[PDB]
Structure formats: structure tokens, C-alpha cells
Design a protein around this ligand. Sequence first.
Ligand code: NAP
Ligand code: GI6
Ligand code: CL
Length: 186
Amino acid sequence: VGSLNCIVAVSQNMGIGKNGDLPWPPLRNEFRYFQRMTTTSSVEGKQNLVIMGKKTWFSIPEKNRPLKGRINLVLSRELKEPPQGAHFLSRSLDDALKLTEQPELANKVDMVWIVGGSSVYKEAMNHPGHLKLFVTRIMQDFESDTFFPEIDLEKYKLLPEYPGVLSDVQEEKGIKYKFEVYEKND
Ligand SMILES: NC(=O)c1ccc[n+]([C@@H]2O[C@H](COP(=O)([O-])OP(=O)(O)OC[C@H]3O[C@@H](n4cnc5c(N)ncnc54)[C@H](OP(=O)(O)O)[C@@H]3O)[C@@H](O)[C@H]2O)c1
Ligand SMILES: CCc1nc(N)nc(N)c1OCCCOc1ccccc1C[C@H](C)C(N)=O
Ligand SMILES: [Cl-]
């Protein structure tokens, strides 16, 4: 199994969601970035695994569940079986990562991507070991009710460039943003 990664888009006031949707209007190329990064596997015959909370799963329109071309896993302690469309359901990120050692996943999974929300990010960033954060910095405030935990800059390095990721300011629909990659290995 490959590397452990988070991917998120974050407003200046650290917001990631409002009313079960994004706090900002749709940004087509931000979405394309999320889709390409989480879907692309370096290894033939393997797919990446996306791990998400329950509310994030239900924020995806039904026509797009599960996330195409990726193995989908949902975190919840209330659900007793994976929701319709999904096939994996774990009680915690710790359990999900242990699940990727069992045969049903060990030979199928390349990279692991955590795709939200708030408490999935929080469990990952306290997880020990090699971890990358792919953070889109949306350069405006947006009203939000779900937030991204602040990055401990004593644990993470900010990479100046990352392969396949442009590092200049992006802009669509009047909104400037920037792709950042953080990395730790404790
Ligand atoms: N901007 C972005 O990058 C981004 C990414 C994803 C989502 N969003 C948006 O953020 C909102 C959804 O995110 P959210 O934080 O509100 O909800 P969420 O994290 O997707 O789901 C919350 C539920 O999922 C379970 N859960 C979450 N973390 C868990 C963990 N570490 N271990 C075990 N279970 C866990 C729990 O389910 P149980 O109560 O059943 O145990 C929790 O109640 C939406 O508005 C979405 O549009 C934005
Ligand atoms: C683009 C937002 C984003 N960007 C970064 N960089 N990282 C993330 N984790 C992230 O969230 C992705 C969460 C999955 O959402 C999907 C996936 C497929 C179809 C529809 C939706 C819901 C749409 C986007 C919505 N409006 O909620
Ligand atoms: Cl931060």
C-alpha cells in the first residue's frame, strides 16, 4: 500500500463547508484538481482509496457515488453497514488504515487519500508517520460551519513545489486560490 495523504480546500477563515455544501460557489479547476489527485494511481492494476466522513459522503450527489475510479470508504460509528453505493465502512481512521492490510484491500490499493471532513482530518494529522497535506488556500473569507484544523508548523514542512502541482495563484469566478503541499514524518 502507498502513501498517506489529505486533500482539502480551505477559506482564509479556515472554513471547508456550510449547510452540507462548499462555502464558495463551484470552482471548476479546483474540483478537477481534487479529482485528478485522488484518482491517479502510479501503479498499474491498483486504485487509490478515498476515506471520508459520513456527511462528506452524503454531500456528493447520488449520481456521483461512489467516487468513480477510486475505492470508497466511509467513517461512522452509527451506520451498521456501508451506505448504498459504498462497500467499506470503518469506525475510525485507525481502523480503516488497519483494514488496508487485509487481503481484500492490500493488493488493490495504491495511495490513500483522506477527503474530509473536519474530524477525519483531525485524526489523520495526529496519526504518527509519513503524512502529506494537499491544501488549497482560497484567498477570501466565506461563511462556514465546518473548519479545517490548523496545521502544526513545528511538525510540517511546506514544500515550495510539488511534482504535477502548479504553485502560482489560480483564479476562477473572481476567487483567487493557491495549491500548497505540507509534509511531515514523525
Ligand atoms: N472544502 C473541502 O475540502 C471539503 C471536503 C469535504 C467536505 N466538505 C464539506 O464539509 C462538510 C462535511 O464535512 P463535516 O466535517 O461536516 O462531516 P464529515 O466529517 O464528513 O462527517 C461527520 C461524521 O462522519 C463520522 N466521522 C467523522 N470523522 C470521523 C472519525 N475520525 N472517526 C470516525 N467517524 C468519523 C462521524 O459519523 P457518526 O456520527 O455516524 O459516527 C461524524 O459524525 C460539507 O459541507 C462538505 O461539503 C468540504
Ligand atoms: C472540490 C472540493 C474539494 N477540494 C479539495 N481540494 N479537497 C477536497 N477534499 C474537496 O472536497 C471534495 C469532496 C468530494 O465532493 C464531491 C466529489 C465529487 C462530486 C461532487 C462532490 C461535492 C461537491 C464538490 C460539493 N459542492 O460539495
Ligand atoms: Cl493553517
